[PDB]
Amino acid sequence: NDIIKSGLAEKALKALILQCEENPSLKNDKDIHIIINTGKKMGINRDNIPRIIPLTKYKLFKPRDLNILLITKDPSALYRETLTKDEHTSELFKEIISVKNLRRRFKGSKLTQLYKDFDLVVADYRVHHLLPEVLGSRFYHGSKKLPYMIRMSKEVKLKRQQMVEKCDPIYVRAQLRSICKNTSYIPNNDNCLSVRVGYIQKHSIPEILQNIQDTINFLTDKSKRPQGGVIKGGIISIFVKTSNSTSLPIYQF
Amino acid sequence: IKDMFSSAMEVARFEGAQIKTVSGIRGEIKRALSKPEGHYRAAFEDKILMSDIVILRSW
Amino acid sequence: IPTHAPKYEENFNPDKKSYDPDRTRSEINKMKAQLKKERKFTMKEIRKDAK
Amino acid sequence: RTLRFYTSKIDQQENKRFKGDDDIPYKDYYQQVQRGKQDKKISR
Amino acid sequence: THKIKYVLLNCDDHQGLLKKMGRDISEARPDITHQCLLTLLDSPINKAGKLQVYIQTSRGILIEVNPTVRIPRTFKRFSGLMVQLLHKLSIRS
Amino acid sequence: SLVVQHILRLLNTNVDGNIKIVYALTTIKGVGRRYSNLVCKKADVDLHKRAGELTQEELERIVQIMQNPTHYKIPAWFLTLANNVESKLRDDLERLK
Amino acid sequence: AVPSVQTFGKKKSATAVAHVKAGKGLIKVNGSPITLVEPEILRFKVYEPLLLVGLDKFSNIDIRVRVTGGGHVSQVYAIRQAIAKGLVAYHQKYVDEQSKNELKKAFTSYDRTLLIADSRRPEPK
Amino acid sequence: VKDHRYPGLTPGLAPVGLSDEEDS
RNA sequence: UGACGGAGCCAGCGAGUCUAACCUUGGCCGAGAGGUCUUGGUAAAAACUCCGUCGU
Numbered sequence: 166n167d168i169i170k171s172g173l174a175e176k177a178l179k180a181l182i183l184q185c186e187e188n189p190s191l192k193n194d195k196d197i198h199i200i201i202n203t204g205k206k207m208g209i210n211r212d213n214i215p216r217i218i219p220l221t222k223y224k225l226f227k228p229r230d231l232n233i234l235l236i237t238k239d240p241s242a243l244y245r246e247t248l249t250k251d252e253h254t255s256e257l258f259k260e261i262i263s264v265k266n267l268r269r270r271f272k273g274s275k276l277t278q279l280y281k282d283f284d285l286v287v288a289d290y291r292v293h294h295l296l297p298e299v300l301g302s303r304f305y306h307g308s309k310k311l312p313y314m315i316r317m318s319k320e321v322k323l324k325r326q327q328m329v330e331k332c333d334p335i336y337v338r339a340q341l342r343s344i345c346k347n348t349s350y351i352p353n354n355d356n357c358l359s360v361r362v363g364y365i366q367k368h369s370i371p372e373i374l375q376n377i378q379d380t381i382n383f384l385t386d387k388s389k390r391p392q393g394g395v396i397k398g399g400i401i402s403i404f405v406k407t408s409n410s411t412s413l414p415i416y417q418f
Numbered sequence: 419i420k421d422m423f424s425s426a427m428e429v430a431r432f433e434g435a436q437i438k439t440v441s442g443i444r445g446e447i448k449r450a451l452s453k454p455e456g457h458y459r460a461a462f463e464d465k466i467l468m469s470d471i472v473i474l475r476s477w
Numbered sequence: 478i479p480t481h482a483p484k485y486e487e488n489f490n491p492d493k494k495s496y497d498p499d500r501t502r503s504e505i506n507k508m509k510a511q512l513k514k515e516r517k518f519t520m521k522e523i524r525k526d527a528k
Numbered sequence: 529r530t531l532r533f534y535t536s537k538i539d540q541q542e543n544k545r546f547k548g549d550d551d552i553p554y555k556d557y558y559q560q561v562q563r564g565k566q567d568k569k570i571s572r
Numbered sequence: 573t574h575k576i577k578y579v580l581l582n583c584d585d586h587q588g589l590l591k592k593m594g595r596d597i598s599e600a601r602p603d604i605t606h607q608c609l610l611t612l613l614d615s616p617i618n619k620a621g622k623l624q625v626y627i628q629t630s631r632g633i634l635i636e637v638n639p640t641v642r643i644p645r646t647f648k649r650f651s652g653l654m655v656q657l658l659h660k661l662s663i664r665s
Numbered sequence: 666s667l668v669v670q671h672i673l674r675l676l677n678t679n680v681d682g683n684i685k686i687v688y689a690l691t692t693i694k695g696v697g698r699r700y701s702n703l704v705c706k707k708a709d710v711d712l713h714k715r716a717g718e719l720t721q722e723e724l725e726r727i728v729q730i731m732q733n734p735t736h737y738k739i740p741a742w743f744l745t746l747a748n749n750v751e752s753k754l755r756d757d758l759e760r761l762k
Numbered sequence: 763a764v765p766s767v768q769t770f771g772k773k774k775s776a777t778a779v780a781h782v783k784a785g786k787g788l789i790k791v792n793g794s795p796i797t798l799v800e801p802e803i804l805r806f807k808v809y810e811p812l813l814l815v816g817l818d819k820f821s822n823i824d825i826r827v828r829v830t831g832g833g834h835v836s837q838v839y840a841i842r843q844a845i846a847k848g849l850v851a852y853h854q855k856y857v858d859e860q861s862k863n864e865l866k867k868a869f870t871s872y873d874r875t876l877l878i879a880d881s882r883r884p885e886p887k
Numbered sequence: 888v889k890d891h892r893y894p895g896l897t898p899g900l901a902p903v904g905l906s907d908e909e910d911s
Numbered sequence: 912u913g914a915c916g917g918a919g920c921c922a923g924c925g926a927g928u929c930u931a932a933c934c935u936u937g938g939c940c941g942a943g944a945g946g947u948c949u950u951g952g953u954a955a956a957a958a959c960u961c962c963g964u965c966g967u
Contacts, residue, residue: 180558193951200949202938211948214899229740242917253910256703259742266917273955290896302932307950314899322890339908340901347902355948357938391898404938408951412937413561427757430523454933454954468931478621480545480642481665482552487652490577491659508747515751519758526761549614551645565937572942688965698915698965738911775922800920801960833921834959 168381168403168416169374177405177413178370184410185365194407197363199377199415201384202356204398209352213297213305215313216392217349218360218383222375224346225364228338231345232259234279236288236296236312239263244289244317244332251334257341259283264292268299276301280310287341290314308351308359315340348380352395360384365407377403377415419472420457426450429458432474439470447474573655580651599630606650609643633658673716675724676731682717689716690727700743704730707737767851771843772879776832778840780848784856785824787817791841792829804838811846811876814868819861823852839875846876 168174178197185191237244241263248254248261259282262270271279280303288296293314297305304310318331350360360380363373381403387394404412423429429450437460438444445462460472486496497503546552574581574589581590583600590597609625617623618639625637635657644650657663671682680689690701705712708726710719730737734744766783789796789812799808812820827844829837846869853862869876890896 176557184558198950200938206947212895214895216899217901219902229738232742240918245917256740277954290890290893290900293895294893301955303953303955307952309951313901314896315901316888316896321888322892324891335908336903339903342907343901343903346907353948355939357948359938359949392902402938406937406950409936411558411562411565413558427520427523430520431527433524433527465927465929467929478619479640480547481640482546482642483644483653483663484665485653485656485663487555487649488577489652489656489659505747508751512747512751512754515754515758519754519761522758523761546642549645552642552649685965691965803960829921831922835921837921 166378169378171416174374174377174405174415175370177415178373181405181407181410181413182365182370185407188410191407191410194409195365196361196407197365197373198359198406198408199362199380200404200406200412201358201360201381201396202401202403203358203396204356204401206356207352207354207358207395209354209395211351211353213311213351214293215311215349215351217343217347218380218393219343219347220376220379222379223368223372225348225361225368225376226345228257228341228345231284232282233257233285233287233341234259234283235261235315236267236286236292237261237263237317238289238291239265241266243330247332248334248337253338254334257338264295264299277303280304283310285345286310286312287315287344288312290316311351313344313349315344348376350380350384356401358384358396362405377405419460420454422472422474423450423456423458425455426452426458429456435474437472437474439466439472441466441470443470445472573658578655578659580654582651602651602654603647606643606647609637610645613637613639613641613643671717673719673724676728680716682715684716685712686710686714686716686719687712696731697743703739703743707739765852765856767848767855769844769847769851771840771845771847773836773839773843774832776829776836776840778827778829778837778844780825780827780844782823782825782848782852784822787821788824789820789827789845790825791827799838799841801834801838804835807838808841808845810842810873811849811869814872815849815865819849819853819865823849825849839880843876843879850877 181197185194235244235248235258241261245261248258279300286300286304293312296312300312304312315337317337318333319336320329320331322328348361350358352358362376362380368376381400383389383393384396385394385400387397399418400416401418402414403416405415406412423432429447432447433449435447436444437447439462443462443464443466445460445466448459448461451457451459466472497506573579574593576586576589579586580602581593581600582602583590583597586600587597590600605627609627612618612623612625615623621639624639627635627637629635644653653663673680673682675690676693678693680692684692687698687701687705690696690704691698696704702712704727707730708723710723710727730739764783766781769780769782771778771780791799791808796808796812797805799805825845825848827841829841831837832840850862850865850869853865866877888897888900
């Protein structure tokens with residue numbers, strides 16, 4: 166909790182926020198990231214699979230706020246039908262599409278339009294490895310719209326047996342709330358790492374600071390492995406920045 | 419080919435010019451491409467690779 | 478039966494260019510066309526000179 | 529509303545299209561950081 | 573129509589030009605065609621929506637006249653419309 | 666012998682009575698088929714009505730649903746150079762001569 | 763060994779291979795019953811042989827047809843030609859020749875395409 | 888929760904809590 | 912002789928260790944060259960059959 170106490174983090178955030186109003190070039194920048202310099206190489210190959218960091222104190226977003234796309238296994242008739250009819254998940258998704266339909270309908274420039282329309286992309290965990298080819302490069306560089314894995318039903322698999330195909334609307338709704346409210350990160354095999362912590366004009370400076378400590382606590386705690394405890398060896402430094410602003414230091418070792 | 423010429427008007431001057439790769443594959447500048455500016459079409463005596471670099475010898 | 482009046486430009490000339498409500502929109506269209514005509518001519522002369 | 533208004537409409541309807549021979553109409557800390565990074569690169 | 577701006581060829585206005593064209597000036601009178609259009613469209617039957625007017629130009633161009641139209645009365649303005657019609661292939665409200 | 670049982674102005678828009686309420690409200694700018702369906706659902710107005718059949722209170726409810734969407738928990742997903750080029754080209758032409 | 767015959771039907775690029783063997787009236791196309799052939803509008807086209815000669819003849823045999831290539835219509839014509847040719851071949855090999863003659867007479871009376879391939883070879887003129 | 892096919896599931900799976908399941 | 916969504920299903924040509932983007936925001940290492948990562952923007956079988964909705 167030392168980083169919250171230090172005034173350097175507060176003073177940097179005030180400068181970063183102040184700049185975004187003054188500078189025209191940063192007008193479209195809305196999210197605040199923290200850049201972490203881990204002491205040693207993580208050693209985890211980038212699998213493009215998001216890992217969720219639970220932010221206990223505060224909630225980054227709610228399912229209602231964002232344009233959510235769902236990519237389901239073929240056929241999508243079962244999953245689309247159950248989600249749409251049930252009251253809880255009726256309005257939870259912008260659109261529901263299958264992998265094959267997504268490949269056929271959207272190609273070339275149509276992919277770029279799909280990226281702009283939707284703020285969050287989620288997919289059945291089974292089809293996730295297929296998405297990089299279908300969605301294209303634009304989704305899978307930069308980490309702004311990486312698809313999130315979700316499990317449709319709580320049923321588990323056993324070797325030499327067949328999965329029963331079910332859809333639990335409450336469970337699907339339950340996971341999606343966790344994704345939007347909590348922040349997420351993607352491992353890579355180096356020092357550097359980027360995690361979203363707040364949103365301009367939505368979170369006050371003290372709120373953003375609390376999220377930062379929650380992110381640091383989860384990433385450093387070895388008890389949270391494999392999801393957490395990935396930054397071993399301490400943190401040399403931490404910066405704060407928007408998408409296009411420069412990195413402002415907030416903690417140095 | 420790309421990065422040889424900055425606009426199609428430049429390519430218009432050099433149409434039919436002899437060019438070769440580093441590998442020794444000779445070729446010709448056939449025509450200027452409308453999009454993007456400066457790109458053009460060239461035909462080589464044999465298939466070239468992406469690693470290769472095309473060169474126009476001028477004085 | 479309902480009655481309307483025809484719409485027409487007195488002293489019409491088809492070779493002449495359709496009148497445009499906005500002057501900036503008309504002027505740029507004049508400038509764009511001069512570019513296409515001028516660009517096509519310059520490329521043609523350069524190609525002949527190169528040959 | 530008032531009864532007088534409906535009289536106006538009724539009379540207006542009676543009064544209420546070319547006809548006859550009518551013709552057609554005529555016509556500073558951030559700046560500190562920025563220099564800090566730039567200064568380091570040139571120093572190297 | 574013909575260039576001098578394009579003008580509807582007239583029997584009395586353009587004698588010199590029509591002699592050059594070689595067609596006899598006696599048969600160059602749209603005023604008759606204007607005249608028939610005027611009387612027909614103002615007749616009560618057209619006002620009753622039971623009349624539609626078709627015109628066959630001598631050259632062979634066939635014109636459809638919607639009954640709704642209100643052609644300008646003066647012969648001068650009417651000539652203004654025909655050149656646009658023959659060139660634009662249609663006239664809009 | 667005694668048995669007792671066309672246009673509406675909503676939101677600065679005229680909607681025909683005969684048309685279905687959902688597709689009637691689609692005509693209002695910014696209102697889609699899905700948005701019309703949801704506003705009808707929240708207003709507890711049967712979608713299978715016709716716009717004429719709607720009562721005054723139900724129309725009012727639709728109005729408050731539209732104007733206060735966040736209050737009623739609606740999700741957000743509903744809510745000169747040419748001359749320079751010419752001069753450059755002219756320089757190229759003159760220079761070519 | 764079980765008595766069996768094999769025949770081919772061809773229409774444009776569509777090719778059908780029909781195996782006809784002694785059996786119990788099991789007709790299949792691409793591993794599915796003949797009733798499920800699509801498009802439904804042309805289904806009776808495929809039925810044309812079965813109805814011309816009567817279902818009784820098929821009651822004693824199983825027909826398996828595998829179709830590849832071409833579009834819907836060409837595949838339908840390939841299937842019907844293959845079925846007709848296979849039935850006539852089986853009646854030739856393992857039944858009397860008089861029935862073979864009756865079948866050929868009926869099919870050629872109705873539509874000779876059921877037996878002879880329709881090849882629209884180009885003719886310069 | 889683990890699926891043998893897809894080891895990526897065990898990391899990067901949404902944590903679910905009582906507050907999250909409760910209706911708004 | 913429409914638009915939207917879903918479902919069903921049918922080709923034939925083609926096989927060089929060869930096949931294919933651009934511009935940015937920053938962290939770290941490195942004497943340099945450069946290496947690695949991070950990040951926002953720009954660009955990039957169909958017909959056919961069936962079912963459901965709106966409606967000209």
